[PDB]
Design a protein around this ligand. Sequence first.
Ligand code: HEM
Ligand code: HEM
Ligand SMILES: Oc1cccc(O)c1
Ligand SMILES: Oc1cccc(O)c1
Ligand SMILES: Oc1cccc(O)c1
Ligand SMILES: Oc1cccc(O)c1
Ligand SMILES: [Cl-]
Ligand SMILES: [Cl-]
Ligand SMILES: [Cl-]
Ligand SMILES: [Cl-]
Ligand SMILES: [Cl-]
Ligand SMILES: [Cl-]
Ligand code: NA
Ligand code: NA
Lengths: 480, 480, 480, 480
Amino acid sequence: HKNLTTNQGVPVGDNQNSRTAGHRGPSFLDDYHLIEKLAHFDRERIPERVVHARGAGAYGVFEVENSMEKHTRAAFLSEEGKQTDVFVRFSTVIHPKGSPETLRDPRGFAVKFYTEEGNYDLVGNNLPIFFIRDALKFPDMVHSLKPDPVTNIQDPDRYWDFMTLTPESTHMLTWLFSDEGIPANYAEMRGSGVHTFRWVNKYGETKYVKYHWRPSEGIRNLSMEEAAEIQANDFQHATRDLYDRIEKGNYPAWDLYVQLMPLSDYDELDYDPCDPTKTWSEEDYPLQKVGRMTLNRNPENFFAETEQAAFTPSALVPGIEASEDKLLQGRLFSYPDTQRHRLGANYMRIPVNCPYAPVHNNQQDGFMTTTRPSGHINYEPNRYDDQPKENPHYKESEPVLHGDRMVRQKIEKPNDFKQAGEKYRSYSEEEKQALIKNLTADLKGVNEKTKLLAICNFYRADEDYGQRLADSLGVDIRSY
Amino acid sequence: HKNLTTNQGVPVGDNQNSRTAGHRGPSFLDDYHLIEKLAHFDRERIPERVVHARGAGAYGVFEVENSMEKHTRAAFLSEEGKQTDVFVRFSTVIHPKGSPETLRDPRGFAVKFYTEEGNYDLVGNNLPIFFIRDALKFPDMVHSLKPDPVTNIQDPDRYWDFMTLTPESTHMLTWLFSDEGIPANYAEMRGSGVHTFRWVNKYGETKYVKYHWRPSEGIRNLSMEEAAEIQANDFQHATRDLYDRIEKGNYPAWDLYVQLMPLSDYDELDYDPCDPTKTWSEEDYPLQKVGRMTLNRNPENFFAETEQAAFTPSALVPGIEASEDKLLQGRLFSYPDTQRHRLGANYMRIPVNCPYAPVHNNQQDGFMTTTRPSGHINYEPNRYDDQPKENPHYKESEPVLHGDRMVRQKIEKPNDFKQAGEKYRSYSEEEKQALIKNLTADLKGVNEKTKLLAICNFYRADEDYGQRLADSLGVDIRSY
Amino acid sequence: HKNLTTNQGVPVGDNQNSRTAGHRGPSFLDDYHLIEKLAHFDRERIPERVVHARGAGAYGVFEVENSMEKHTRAAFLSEEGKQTDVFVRFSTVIHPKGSPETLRDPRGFAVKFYTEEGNYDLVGNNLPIFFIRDALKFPDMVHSLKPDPVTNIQDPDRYWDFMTLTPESTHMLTWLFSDEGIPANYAEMRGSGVHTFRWVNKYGETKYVKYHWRPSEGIRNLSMEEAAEIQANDFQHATRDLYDRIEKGNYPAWDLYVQLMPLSDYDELDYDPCDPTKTWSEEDYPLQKVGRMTLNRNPENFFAETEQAAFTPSALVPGIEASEDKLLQGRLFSYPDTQRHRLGANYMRIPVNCPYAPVHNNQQDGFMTTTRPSGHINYEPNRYDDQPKENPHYKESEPVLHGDRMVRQKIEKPNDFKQAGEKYRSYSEEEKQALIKNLTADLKGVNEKTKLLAICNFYRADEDYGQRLADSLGVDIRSY
Amino acid sequence: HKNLTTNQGVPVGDNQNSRTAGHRGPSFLDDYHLIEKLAHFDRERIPERVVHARGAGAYGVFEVENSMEKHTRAAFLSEEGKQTDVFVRFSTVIHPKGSPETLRDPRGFAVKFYTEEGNYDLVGNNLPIFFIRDALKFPDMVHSLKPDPVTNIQDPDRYWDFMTLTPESTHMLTWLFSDEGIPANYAEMRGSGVHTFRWVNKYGETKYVKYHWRPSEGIRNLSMEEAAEIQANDFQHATRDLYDRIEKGNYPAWDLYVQLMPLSDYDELDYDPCDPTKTWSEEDYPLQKVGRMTLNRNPENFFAETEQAAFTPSALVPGIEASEDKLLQGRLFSYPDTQRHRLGANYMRIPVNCPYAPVHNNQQDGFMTTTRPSGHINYEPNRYDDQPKENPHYKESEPVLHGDRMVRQKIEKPNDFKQAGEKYRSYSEEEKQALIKNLTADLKGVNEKTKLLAICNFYRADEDYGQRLADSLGVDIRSY
Ligand code: HEM
Ligand code: HEM
Ligand SMILES: Oc1cccc(O)c1
Ligand SMILES: Oc1cccc(O)c1
Ligand SMILES: Oc1cccc(O)c1
Ligand SMILES: Oc1cccc(O)c1
Ligand SMILES: [Cl-]
Ligand SMILES: [Cl-]
Ligand SMILES: [Cl-]
Ligand SMILES: [Cl-]
Ligand SMILES: [Cl-]
Ligand SMILES: [Cl-]
Ligand code: NA
Ligand code: NA
């Protein structure tokens, strides 16, 4: 038994009635409990994420099966059996917070590893490639996919306009308009790092690395029709499914694999290994098992933990570094940037975002300083040996630069169509029918010029792909 | 033909490629366009409304059919034929932005009238009563209805716990669990002021008033099955319908009616006429036609106009005043309070929120001061005859207080069950079946003790109502 | 010995050099330590207080000498010897954060008591009366005093315009333009509650109360010339003095006294006992000793504790209530209102602001939620006996209301001039000379019509007062 | 004659009295005017600048005397006689708003040129060099200078600890501790761009450039004693002086000169020409006159225009580019970053910040959207020829990179002491005495080890400089 109180810790005598002029009269300004309670209620909401607003979170554990010290000095990967706590958020992409989980979209797959050398965030998606290869385009791509800024409804004519004029999107669309565009839920879903990263070992040797998460529950997708049937009855079915699995002890898991590639393979390839519109062949760069992540604990409060969770591809740990991927390079900025706005300058003190490893630096102040700071010395260098100092054992590598000028220029060997064709041809007949069906439903109402350009991009990927789509849409492409 | 520019007005030479060390190298910090563009993208989102987050807006005109000058000095209602521009937002209540418009909920019906004596907001709902009668309870009610703070899913066990222990909710629930709980769209929908207000005429005489909006399009509601079928195909059908009707010239309209009641009628009624859980009998207080509102223009930008729209029940004009309704009283505070948070201190300068009537006062500064202020004199009284002065012609009335003391005390004559029973008995047999069906599907999984308490509250409203609900739920209530 | 780290807990390898293209080239975007460190730096500052921006804080202890249980049920005053921790901030009023502490102004004297029944804030000044008696005028008065909104310099012509047209200010100015307008430092300074409050005992009996703090260090004031001489070498002398006293173990202290007055004395007086322009005679309502406050500890971090400290007159505890003073009534609203803006919705979780008493309520979320919330139940009423409930033993009193209407109307018996005259006559000859000198230097450059109105207000207080000021200003008032 | 109104445009009947229970009773919640007026007052303040918080602004005109088209394509410099509007803000550095203008500090000299190709900000100081050469150190330097985080008083022992351990500061301190460390006012003051920039002409040819502003009023400084005498009577004398000059028609002016240096001169200088701790010889790189800036208009509102002014070194225009200077490189980021926090995401729409040149882009939304956006197309590429497109005539240059790796490494040829010695020897005997006097007063209380290190740095600049300082401080330097 407990008293209801104000935020001043005064017990509340009456949580039912406002203070008024007799039992029916107007209300008095001197009602601190009323005003305090309504003023806080009036301030509950913070801005949603600019993308991936709809999502759900869980905690778990990552365990190393095969130590990776030959290839990376990352502490959390250094010994067989080594266990690291994680927090994970899954998400959709485009629509706002309360939107259905049955819509077509990539799904977010964001893993925060609380390591002994700091927090490591691997901010992935289910699908292993992306629509674009330069961050400068991301607001455009997003604006095109987001609800129309006049009508508040998503319009295929808008995002197809952008995508068709951005033919590097052709590989991604070939995956997204398979039925994997609507995963059955967050458990029965692939995960991918997408980008090439650099792994650096204790000798300073570097490899390119790709990450892949393979669901213990298998991959399962929804057709458009199966999605509609779910949507009719539940607009948060994946959020429900994840919570429910974990509450009943049926913990979902994923095995982590990597691919590794020498830096010197750049010239051996007909695409850029750091173009995030490209996968690497599993035949040429085989998947190597690392370990397993199991999610086994729901959050205690959705807002405090899942809503306020902050992930960044720039939360890298010794041994793991960015590649030159221009898309990744902009993400390194944009995540902490948006989080300072969304969550406050001190968002890194919110519990879910706090490292397990110690934090000591000379940053200070900012909105909502809750950490009881102390001491006179908030600058370095200083004369005091006991104050925090830089540690040269933790310097990052020094990547070689091949360019001799500061330029704005597309990568060489963009190769926009070849992998899309390879993917298309890798589909079963049943999967090819689904892809054509889904693309046809999306493209049938768009501007004719845009519709033709889409067909041409897919035709350049594979002639059969393009021809089938043309026939399904009633578009005669004989004169080309 | 136009240049893309930065926010500094410098034309952009390349909107495709980040600035990099050669064609494929890492990105440079000196890329003002990349950073400016991403940093603004990163800051697009503001907090959604704490309730009524999902909604849609339109502009139009209100035209007076019958002058109301016998009863109110309100300027916009003074003359036959007098036209006042309006902005209107419609909304659901509980779920976030992006949520479906096929869910059970009251619907918001918020009208801003841009009058010659200032902006007048009538911030209504479709349904004419409310669940509670004191604002101190509003955060509780909302929290009970909102998705569970652990699971992020709405849970009937939670809101039925609250409602059943708040039996003044019984009349509201008797309307909301009719099929009017799911309006077909925003056009084919009732509107209501809900509260009693005070109308004050040129002689200073006051009457109680209620407001009603009657759709020219008639009322159409969705059964739970029809709502499911629409939810499957379109999560935003009401937003779509409203835009589309207006774009095709099929402008929706509502007639405005009032009921009027003498102050003195308090003492003779068996309920409090300022209890917003009560309606007034249309036999005893007949609807009187005032005018018609037609919505004929979509906004140019959904975020700037509909998202940023701010309404408050405290935006009253001369001739129209609050009543003593303890629910209304809290609303006077909470709306501009929340809006200062949600939108900024200067939210009243956002174009949709601006009055047509001139604004002159000694307020200053605050975030995002865009108005080019000038002058030395920002205080009153002052010696300058040309500076803004108070104007005694515009004083509000001086309501009589019946209370002796500052108290926290429930109103007399709460009468929580009688009108709910009257409503129930007014339903056709088909409508009583729908009610019971919709209640049954909501209650069937709730805690048994809460379930029984719901049944008892409805049984107190009407025996046949309560017994049918009990029969439908398999609950034997004969021992009580 | 400690590593410098990022906020992710990654040790920093180099805290000297940015990451660049070779040793002399431009900087890279992928420098997380640079960006994180600059971005936090860029966000250190929050808005200063709207008034009393310049100030200094200290902790200490309040110890009861004479229990007050006969007059108030306040827990912290219930027993001889009972000790309550305090946090105190002292301040100037008008100028910004870095402004000199040698300027004429009231001084703030804000005491937060961490009691067993919640935090109690007594938000006083040194001077025992105020310029104005209604909170509607506060923004006006402030705007007049503040630096001119064009020039950013304070202008006597502006605030004298306001003050002269607000003659209830005449008592306050008669104190403020004595040399007590510039206290020597914060230790050698009086403290006052200013307002009448209500004390309520365990029988529900109410008295009016005034609070007074008497410095153990005695009162010392600066002449204008002494203030200039300090200002020449130190613009933060009072902040220095306070820190330095406490660091040397020379702890300043104040004894707390109250005056007590029956509610029924209203009719015995020629002023309103709740008019904050008025003092109560010490002959007729003698000072009664309560206890002593000693300040004995400097804060650990000036931003986290002193800058982010939030006090509100509405932080009242059982046994202590507001009076009907219209000036106080507005303050009840304005402090927590400004603090939500200045500090965040969750400002009451900031350590200095936290109560020692337990906090349990159904409030939730808001920016920077750091408190690890949990549980499914965030609403009341609820069916769970272990969740927080209202406690009727802690209801506030029910003050009698004498008015029968909602009005906007000045108090009866404003009596604007009598106490100013009494104060003037109470001054020693030396003190009267300083008053006239100080007023003369302030008035000599103002508008002649305003100047004359000031002289007339002071003449109405006391003929000699007014005549001396007139002579000193070269104004001939023969003919009035 | 004008009515006082609410923000809703309703005329105010009484701007004196709150609404209350009779003439002396407590206040009612239904007082929209009171709560609106107090709530806006409660939100007047925004965060001050993190540095340069104290300052003053004015408008004027820049007129070209010698067209610079041989060296830069900058539009505003292209023709003799061409006039460009400016806004200028002058400032101190370390102390807050409200601090005196008689303190030692660099002075800010920030110039916004409203050019036909966009806004160009030259964000200078009076002194032509800086304490540090890498932006990574800036928060450390600032934190050491700023008031101690515990005491709120600036402590020489703190900043001398930093500066001594940062010996690249030696040249700066040699200027700052001359009497030019306290300019007499803002008009009688030098201006400097500080950094090397790059100028690029219409043929694509690049030169290094430095900017210098020479006051038509001459340079005049204050001794410590002359500063104290002013500080005694006016803590805003420079703000006053500026306003008063312009109001009286006595417009202050500065001639703009540049120094120009071939890129290839790097290799034969004994310093790095992009090290902002270094000046360029005026014998070897003579000052070349460009034009004249006259300040002739005070702002209409200090908050809206001077407080909310936003400058950034990254507001460059075609023809003017950053150099590789590692200090400048971080400024390019930090200014718009802090401004998004300080002012809002849409700070560039605040009138003083708006370009004269057209702004057209696909950015949208964000807090306080006041610009009436319209249109369906917010993404590029798109199919619409009339939507904003990139324009390749406005690409920036492609600087050659000399580095072959991503490194964190100090520049070659730091040469920390040579120019400090040259400056010392360039002082008159009178100026050397002032320098030693000013340094001695600053150093006399600092830690002995730090004090010695300071003496040693200045001794390395010039043996006489160091010996005199040692003698003045009573430090025996023999055993070194
Ligand atoms: C004490 C009772 C209530 C409280 C405390 C309350 C509070 C709120 C709050 C804080 C908002 C968000 C406003 C914004 O950010 O702009 C809101 C929106 C709204 N409320 Fe209420 N509300 C109450 C009762 C009601 C009632 C009785 C109705 C109808 C009679 C209603 C209809 C609405 C509507 C339509 C909106 C959305 C306004 C818009 O379109 O922007 N509310 N309410
Ligand atoms: C890395 C080094 C530096 C950093 C990180 C830095 C950062 C900042 C920041 C964050 C502000 C606040 C600006 C605002 O809120 O609008 C500022 C203001 C200012 N800085 Fe710097 N700064 C640096 C070096 C310099 C240099 C070298 C100069 C002169 C060359 C300078 C001149 C100014 C001026 C004049 C202002 C005030 C502009 C105004 O009037 O608002 N700063 N700086
Ligand atoms: O993220 C996407 C992209 C394309 C279509 C779609 O429905 C969603
Ligand atoms: O707003 C409401 C109230 C009750 C049930 C419901 O589904 C929605
Ligand atoms: O607070 C005040 C009031 C009047 C004069 C002054 O200098 C300060
Ligand atoms: O900016 C500065 C630097 C050094 C001493 C000082 O008083 C101010
Ligand atoms: Cl921000
Ligand atoms: Cl740091
Ligand atoms: Cl006002
Ligand atoms: Cl706020
Ligand atoms: Cl609560
Ligand atoms: Cl853009
Ligand atoms: Na191993
Ligand atoms: Na020329």
